[PDB]
Amino acid sequence: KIVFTEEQEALVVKSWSVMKKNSAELGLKLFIKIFEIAPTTKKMFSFLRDSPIPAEQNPKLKPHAMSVFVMCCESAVQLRKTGKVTVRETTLKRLGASHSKYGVVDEHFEVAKYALLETIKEAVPEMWSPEMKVAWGQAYDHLVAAIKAEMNLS
Numbered sequence: 001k002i003v004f005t006e007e008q009e010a011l012v013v014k015s016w017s018v019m020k021k022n023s024a025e026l027g028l029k030l031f032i033k034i035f036e037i038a039p040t041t042k043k044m045f046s047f048l049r050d051s052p053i054p055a056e057q058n059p060k061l062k063p064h065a066m067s068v069f070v071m072c073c074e075s076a077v078q079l080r081k082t083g084k085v086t087v088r089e090t091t092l093k094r095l096g097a098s099h100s101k102y103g104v105v106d107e108h109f110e111v112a113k114y115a116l117l118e119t120i121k122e123a124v125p126e127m128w129s130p131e132m133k134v135a136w137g138q139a140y141d142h143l144v145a146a147i148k149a150e151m152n153l154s
């Protein structure tokens with residue numbers, strides 16, 4: 001259980017409500033960053049319907065990137081309310097299984113975090129601050145800690 005004030009929830013929730021308006025562009029930007037920092041991640045998205053696809057063309061990118069934002073936002077709300085992330089067990093186990101199936105490791109989560117933080121920094125420059133950065137980072141960290149615990153565990 002951590003301290004997470006409603007001020008902190010509000011930074012995440014309010015910035016997301018702004019960014020949500022251009023979420024198509026934003027999700028693309030997120031993956032373009034990740035793909036640049038670590039091109040090996042491209043091959044996690046290089047096959048669609050049992051056939052090669054260039055990873056940037058993959059229709060799962062935008063809903064995937066959307067998921068990252070939405071679930072961090074939900075996690076911010078949960079942290080403030082309960083001091084922890086709680087994802088219904090079955091969905092969490094599935095999230096664990098899905099990521100480990102695709103060979104996602106710590107470094108990928110670290111690269112995505114850095115990329116997520118930079119995309120936010122650039123999407124909402126007049127809301128950006130060290131505390132904004134802490135609030136999204138904390139939400140991401142705890143979400144990923146929960147998913148990881150189902151990647152380690154069987």
Ligand code: HEM
Pocket residue numbers: 034041044045060064067068071094095098099102104108109112140143144
């Ligand atoms: C906050 C962290 C993350 C969240 C919330 C998230 C969200 C999701 C969701 C909802 C799915 C679909 C799960 C399913 O239907 O079983 C998924 C699958 C996937 N994710 Fe993530 N993800 C995260 C981090 C990452 C990272 C860092 C990578 C690698 C760069 C990654 C790569 C993948 C891959 C390869 C799949 C499988 C997609 C497919 O089935 O074609 N994820 N993720």
